[PDB]
Amino acid sequence: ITGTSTVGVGRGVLGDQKNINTTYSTYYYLQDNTRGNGIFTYDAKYRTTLPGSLWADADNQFFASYDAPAVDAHYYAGVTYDYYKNVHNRLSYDGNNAAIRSSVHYSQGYNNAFWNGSQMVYGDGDGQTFIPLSGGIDVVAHELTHAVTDYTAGLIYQNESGAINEAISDIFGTLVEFYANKNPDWEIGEDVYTPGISGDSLRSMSDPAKYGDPDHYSKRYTGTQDNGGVHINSGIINKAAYLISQGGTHYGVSVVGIGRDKLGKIFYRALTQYLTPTSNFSQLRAAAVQSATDLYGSTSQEVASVKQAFDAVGVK
């Protein structure tokens, strides 16, 4: 839209109030004209035709229980964009202020949300297994991170590489949840995964095995399904990535933590300046070790911790 940037206001999936950036012209559309070449959001209309119709509001106030996904799936994108900019110095996913489009209410009770290649997508959850996946910021960045991983590495979404793509998308998906310091945990989607059981999550990074995810490269799932096990064997890298930030004695291997804002810059550099489509775990090791060297010389604890943290989860 050609229009006048303002600020409206609306309510998340988990009902927080939050000023949003919206674009008046006739109506108020959910076009944050402030970051990048814009961050747009479209009503899918519980249907599949993408990206749907750009979101519009009449009074510029989004509190209706149909807007909760759009808004949460909007505020959270600009917080992510914020991150990648206000740390890593990256301008939207492409790197050159690409326009972050988003669709919400994509199909009936679709228990999922993804990067379609062009754009982030979001369901409303079935209402047993999920609530609107806009609702989690964890969820937004992961699926946005996927796009970064497109326009940097291009790690192909099967086998080890695939397990990496998601892992990154777990890794910066957390490092983004800690940016906003919004009940920040090393967990994946508790806030909007199963309302009927507060105190759980789809995945974990501190302990994946709790949700059927391996925490070593001895327990690496092979079979053709999950595209080799992308949404599974990730768990190895979740642990690795996690262990580094935090530290701990995994299968008897005394790692030493370096905080989450030294995990970022490493995975990011590796993500951006070291990885390939065809990047197995072992190379991820080389890539994280190397990064550390660039970022903190070899004889630093950083290179030493990465080596330790991959030495834990069975990667050489």
Enzyme catalytic residues: 143, 231
Q: What is the CA radius of gyration of the chain?
A: 19
CB 134 within 8 Å of CB 126: no
Binding residue per annotation — 191?
Answer: no
Binding string, residues 114-143; x marks residues near Ca ion by CB under 5 A = ------------------------x-----
CB 108 within 8 Å of CB 136: no
Q: Does 59 bind Ca ion (CB under 5 A)?
A: yes
Answer for which of 72, 124, 170, 191 binds Ca ion (CB under 5 A) is 191
Q: Does 72 bind Ca ion (CB under 5 A)?
A: no
Answer for which of 19, 118, 183, 249 binds Ca ion (CB under 5 A) is 183
Closer to Ca ion by Cβ: residue 85 or 182: 182
Minimum Å gap between C-beta 3 and Ca ion is 17
Residues 308 and 316: their CA atoms lie apart, in Å, by 11
Binding residue per annotation — 160?
Answer: no
Closer to Ca ion by Cβ: residue 57 or 72: 57
Burial label for 94, CB within 10 Å (0-12, 13-18, 19+), is middle
Minimum Å gap between C-beta 297 and Ca ion is 33
Per-residue DSSP letters for 260-312? TTTTHHHHHHHHHHT--SS--HHHHHHHHHHHHHHHH-TTSHHHHHHHHHHHH
3-state SS class at 95: strand
Binding residue per annotation — 124?
Answer: no
Q: Does 181 bind Ca ion (CB under 5 A)?
A: no
Candidate ranges 43-51, 69-77, 161-169, 193-201; the one touching Ca ion (CB under 5 A): 193-201
Interacting residue ranges for Ca ion, rule: CB under 5 A: 57, 59, 61, 138, 183, 187, 191, 194, 200
